[PDB]
Amino acid sequence: MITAQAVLYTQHGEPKDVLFTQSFEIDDDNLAPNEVIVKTLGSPINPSDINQIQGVYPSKPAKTTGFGTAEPAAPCGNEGLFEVIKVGSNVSSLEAGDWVIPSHVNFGTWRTHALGNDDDFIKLPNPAQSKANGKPNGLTINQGATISVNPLTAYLMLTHYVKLTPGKDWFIQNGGTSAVGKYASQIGKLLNFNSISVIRDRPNLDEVVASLKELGATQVITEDQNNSKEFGPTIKEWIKQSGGEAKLALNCVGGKSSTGIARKLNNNGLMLTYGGMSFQPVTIPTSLYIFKNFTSAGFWVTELLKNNKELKTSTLNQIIAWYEEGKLTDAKSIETLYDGTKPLHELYQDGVANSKDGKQLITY
Amino acid sequence: MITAQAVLYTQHGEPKDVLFTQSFEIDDDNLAPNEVIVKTLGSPVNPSDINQIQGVYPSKPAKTTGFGTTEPAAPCGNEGLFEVIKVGSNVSSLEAGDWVIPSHVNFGTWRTHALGNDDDFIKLPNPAQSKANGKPNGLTINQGATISVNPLTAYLMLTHYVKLTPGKDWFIQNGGTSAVGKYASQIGKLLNFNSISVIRDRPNLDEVVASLKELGATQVITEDQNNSREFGPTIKEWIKQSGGEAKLALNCVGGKSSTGIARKLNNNGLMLTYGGMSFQPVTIPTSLYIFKNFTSAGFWVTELLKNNKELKTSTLNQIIAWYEEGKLTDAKSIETLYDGTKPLHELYQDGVANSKDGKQLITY
Amino acid sequence: IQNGGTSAVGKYASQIGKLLNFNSISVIRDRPNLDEVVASLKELGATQVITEDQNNSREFGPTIKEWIKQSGGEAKLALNCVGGKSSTGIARKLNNNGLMLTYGGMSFQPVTIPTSLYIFKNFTSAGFWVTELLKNNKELKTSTLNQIIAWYEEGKLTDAKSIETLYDGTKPLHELYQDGVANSKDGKQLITY
Ligand SMILES: *O([C]1[C]([O])[C]([C]OP([O])(=O)OP(=O)([O-])O[C][C]2O[C]([N+]3=[C][C]=[C]C(C([N])=O)=[C]3)[C]([O])[C]2[O])O[C]1N1[C]=NC2=C1N=[C]N=C2[N])P([O])([O])=O
Ligand SMILES: *O([C]1[C]([O])[C]([C]OP([O])(=O)OP(=O)([O-])O[C][C]2O[C]([N+]3=[C][C]=[C]C(C([N])=O)=[C]3)[C]([O])[C]2[O])O[C]1N1[C]=NC2=C1N=[C]N=C2[N])P([O])([O])=O
């Protein structure tokens, strides 16, 4: 038997209020033919995971007694990295030692172990396998545990919706220092797309600007410049002189910021909203729709890839390859190792509380 | 020779300030082979005309000294009905007595007469011609004078973007008492689409609701109901019981109203914004884009038809046929006759100022 | 509770309900002149008039429950001349141990009742056919007719109004009736002489 720990809730609410830790047993000596047991290496805290516990995100795991609670309870977390420790007599796709991520959302990754079927998981290369394959880099734990949401989001928004002509066309984004924003700048560099990042002003602005330009942003402007009637024509010139067009905007902020990035598109532009900065609706002037033929749409990676294995696979492979090749870099997570000396749910509660410090990764 | 008068401006601004009447002369003896002279039968006041005068509509006629002013001036009005009074020696498509509308925007229809070419005009059947053909009905002056913008707009929004299944699917629209809204309700009825019209409440709501249902609105709700969390599930039920989905929202209002109609769409819905009430942006919650896969887009009839004569002709012929067959009635106009009691420009100024009373038509 | 509320039978039911002091709900199809119709039926004696959309509505159900609770009474009888979804809706509105009488089927749609009403609410669905009921029941016919006559003579009952077409010999009689059949939707038709 294996003694595992899982972070559960029986009722929706704030994570500080409703999370608890449940001890449960996995029988590693009684695997059905297609079953696999995995041990968690690391899982992050994403806003979607929090929203899910809060009961305000319309994709969630069922509440059940399967972790040994009398009250139906749900697990937490939608992405993470695991290591296979044992497989059933009919599993060929996975082997002990393989690294895996969940093949689907709502699996529950804020826990020490899981029993599932082989098709509940997608194999990524472990560093030993990347090296054996002659790659310069194996994946880090953070890179594996955070590969499923933010990198795929950036890549798919940039390539799946409108075709940007390499060396000519532009995308514009707000939240330029966000995880997705930073991946989008790198991917624009890799694919030869021009881009403008819009960021909030700060004391070390010129420094942040240089850092984003190194990642791949062609130009970086402040939210004040995005708002600025005076500054607008300068942006028009950048795009005009390049020979291409600003065809795509990526919005994770809403409000004035979304208006600002939409205004900077050429006619027939598309905006994708993939996130929201608390309470702020997407605000677009009527004139853009009517006279510029602007279009505003959504992006949700969970829904897009729900029943599109081929698109997931192809996108995942590209992200893995770029990590192995050293061509893509993650932002560093704040990593908190689960010891057994402190209840697991408290580690994630702290992580929720300390969210603004940076991405929280609980490790094992 | 012909003494005419035109409503002109030399500077953009509010119609109450910038409009004047100019008397000018047209040489009906000195007519080139391809030329045609027309007399105005009537022309409506549309928001686009007013916006054009105000300087906030990016499609307008050149300013010139052609009407006999020292300061370069522009004519007003983009649609209207004319009678052909004389044609040149090489014109075969038109003859004296024929009804015509402008073939393009920016012609100047707030005036008594015009001199152009044969290709600046489109023939509509006059009432004698409809009767000589076999039709039960001939077009009224209002019907002809308002055929080119509002009926085409409603038709194209309902048919050109998403396919509604006859007998089950639904569209929703605000500005339900507008001329476009009235055309859209009738066209919806004719094409067997279900619809919800959203209107502002008023003391005679009863009367207004009945009128719209008679036109073809399946349901009529107020903007209070549009805003109501409590009422939302009632709308959902209407749609579910029909076996169809609400796939299309038509927005000419913006603000809270636009939010409300977007929210009533089934997932994967499309909004078309074709208008907007004075300083009030299209506001959509982030959740609709992300979780409902909502799309917000624009519609501009001028632009859509600029380089598409086949679509224009085909849409136009349907409206004409429906009028002749007695299947479509016009959005009614308040008709003011230019009979010399008051100068021409004041008729249009009064028309602009009385816009809230309903659609305004100046007749001749 | 009855559907086909604008029918001639529906209009007599509303009036008879008022005369006998029964509360009633009439269900009618939505129409442009909805307000005028609702008013006519309320004046006849319907306590409440709802549309078929309201009849279909799970959201609206609790409002009807409020009305009945406030009255101190129960919805004991449903009258169905429509069938289909309409018959479903009026059945659901009955209190437990309810009865429905189907006397017509104004669309070809069958009487449709959720299994749960039968099993859990002890609902019963039966038929009504005045011709069969009165075949060997001449005393019952006479008594009923006499009451209607008396009510008319007393000014307590009015007629479901007819659109009258006079036969005068210039158009064949069968064509008057054929027009009457074709104009059924406009309302009750009476050929006069
Ligand atoms: O509500 C008001 C009316 O419903 C409406 C005005 O109606 P109208 O008949 O004078 O105007 P129309 O000619 O029908 O269309 C005007 C709007 O549509 C746009 N448009 C039309 C055709 C083609 C194009 C295109 N893009 O191809 C565009 C045009 O720009 C106009 O916007 O407005 C209602 N109203 C007025 N103020 C309002 C309001 N509704 C909500 N809130 C406010 N502020 P009533 O009946 O008076 O209550
Ligand atoms: O809705 C329609 C009307 O409400 C209704 C018809 O009204 P009517 O006056 O022309 O008909 P009546 O003479 O009152 O009776 C019609 C029905 O009752 C049956 N009947 C009557 C007497 C005796 C017997 C009996 N079993 O002893 C039976 C008769 O067979 C008729 O069925 O119908 C409504 N209607 C019409 N189409 C409908 C519908 N409702 C729902 N769905 C559809 N498709 P309006 O007012 O026009 O909107």
Tokens linked to A52: 């899910």
CA distance A280 to A251: 12
Q: Do A275 and B282 touch (CB under 8 A)?
A: no
Identify whether the C-beta of residue A126 lies closer than 8 Å to the C-beta of residue A144.
Answer: no
3-class SS at B247?
Answer: strand
Identify whether the C-beta of residue B347 lies closer than 8 Å to the C-beta of residue B16.
Answer: no
Identify whether the C-beta of residue A108 lies closer than 8 Å to the C-beta of residue A45.
Answer: no
Q: Do A284 and B281 touch (CB under 8 A)?
A: yes
Centre of ligand 1 to C-alpha B324, Å, is 27
Work out the number of other CB atoms within 10 angstroms of the CB of residue B280.
15
Domain spanning B148-328, CATH class: alpha beta
Q: What CATH architecture does domain A154-310 belong to?
A: 3-Layer(aba) Sandwich (3.40)
Q: Which ligand is nearest to the CA of C132?
A: 2
Half-sphere exposure of B282 (CA within 13 A, CB side): 30
Beta bridge partners of C78: C100
Phi, psi (rounded to 5 degrees) for C134: -95, 0
Mutate to test the interface with C, among B182, B195, B213 (most CBs of C within 10 A): B213
Residue B43's closest CA among B351, B355, B356, B357? B351
Work out the number of other CB atoms within 10 angstroms of the CB of residue C72.
6
Identify whether the C-beta of residue C125 lies closer than 8 Å to the C-beta of residue C104.
Answer: no
| Beta-sheet pairing, A334-337 with A360-363 | parallel
CA distance C50 to C30: 9
Q: Which ligand is nearest to the CA of B51?
A: 1
Identify whether the C-beta of residue B278 lies closer than 8 Å to the C-beta of residue A285.
Answer: no
Identify whether the C-beta of residue A113 lies closer than 8 Å to the C-beta of residue A46.
Answer: no
| Contacting residues for C111 by C-beta, under 8 A, at least 6 apart | C80, C83, C87, C100, C102, C105, C125
| Contacting residues for B12 by C-beta, under 8 A, at least 6 apart | B18, B53, B54, B55
Tokens linked to C182: 């074709």
Tokens linked to A183: 């991946």
CA distance A125 to A114: 19
Domain boundaries, chain A: 1-153+311-364, 154-310
Phi, psi (rounded to 5 degrees) for B251: -115, 120
Chain B residues touching residue C59 (CB < 8 angstroms): 233-234, 237
3-class SS at B258?
Answer: helix
CB pairs under 8 A between B and C: 26
Q: How far is C97 from chain B (nearest CA, A)?
A: 27
Tokens linked to A20: 């608890």
Which atom of ligand 2 lies at the shortest distance from residue C184's CA? 10
Using the structure block, give the residue that is written with the tokens 């002189």: A241
Chain C residues touching residue B238 (CB < 8 angstroms): 53
Using a CB–CB cutoff of 8 Å, tell me whether B51 touches chain A. no
Mutate to test the interface with A, among B282, B293, B295, B301 (most CBs of A within 10 A): B282
Active site residues of A: 57
- Integer-rounded Cα Rg, in Å, for chain B is 22
Using the structure block, give the residue that is written with the tokens 């929004």: B157
Chain B residues touching residue C31 (CB < 8 angstroms): 213
For residue C102, give the amino acid letter: T
Write the DSSP symbol of residue B80: -
Q: How far is CA B182 from CA A167, B178, B205, B258, C34, in A?
A: 49, 6, 16, 18, 19
| Beta-sheet pairing, C99-102 with C124-127 | parallel
| Beta-sheet pairing, B334-337 with A334-337 | unpaired
Centre of ligand 2 to C-alpha B134, Å, is 39
Question: Which H or E element spans position B173?
Answer: strand B170-173
Specify burial of residue A137 (Cβ count, 10 A radius: 0-12, 13-18, 19+).
Answer: middle
Whether domain B1-147+333-364 has CATH 3.90.180.10 = yes
CA distance B58 to B75: 15
DSSP secondary structure, chain C, as one string: -BS-TTSHHHHHHHHHHHHTT---EEEE---TTHHHHHHHHHHHT-SEEEEHHHHH-TTTHHHHHHHHHHHT----EEEESS-HHHHHHHHHTSPTT-EEEE---SSSPPB---HHHHHHH--EEEE--HHHHTTT-HHHHHHHHHHHHHHHHHT-------EEEE--SSS-HHHHHHHHHHTGGG--EEEE-
Nearest CA in chain B to C60: B234
Which atom of ligand 1 lies at the shortest distance from residue B223's CA? 41
| Beta-sheet pairing, B20-26 with B35-45 | unpaired
Write the DSSP symbol of residue B111: B
Q: How far is B141 from chain C (nearest CA, A)?
A: 28
The CATH number corresponding to A1-153+311-364 among 3.90.180.10, 3.50.50.60, 3.30.420.10, 3.30.9.10 equals: 3.90.180.10
Q: How far is CA B42 from CA B27, B81, B122, in A?
A: 22, 6, 15
Q: What is the 3-state secondary structure (H, E, C) of chain A?
A: CEEEEEEEECCCCCHHHHCEEEEEEECCCCCCCCEEEEEEEEEECCHHHHHHHHCCCCCCCCCECCCCCCCCEEECCCCCEEEEEEECCCCCCCCCCCEEEECCCCCCCCECEEEEEHHHEEEECCHHHHHHCCCCCCCCHHHHHCCCCHHHHHHHHHHCCCCCCCCCCEEEECCCCCHHHHHHHHHHHHHCCEEEEEECCCCCHHHHHHHHHHHCCCEEEEHHHHHCCCCHHHHHHHHHHHCCCEEEEEECCCHHHHHHHHHCCCCCCEEEECCCCCCCCEEECHHHHHHHCCEEEECCHHHHCCCCHHHHHHHHHHHHHHHHCCCCCCCCCEEEECCCCCCHHHHHHHHHHCHHHCCEEEEC
Whether domain C1-157 has CATH 3.40.50.720 = yes
Q: How far is CA C144 from the centre of its chain?
A: 18
Q: How far is CA B23 from CA B157, B342, B349, C102, in A?
A: 40, 14, 17, 76
Method: X-ray
Identify whether the C-beta of residue B147 lies closer than 8 Å to the C-beta of residue B124.
Answer: yes
Residue A286's closest CA among B191, B295, B280? B280
Q: How far is CA A27 from CA A31, A67, B351, in A?
A: 7, 13, 83
Which atom of ligand 2 lies at the shortest distance from residue C37's CA? 46
Beta bridge partners of A334: A360
Residue A100's closest CA among A122, A67, A119? A122
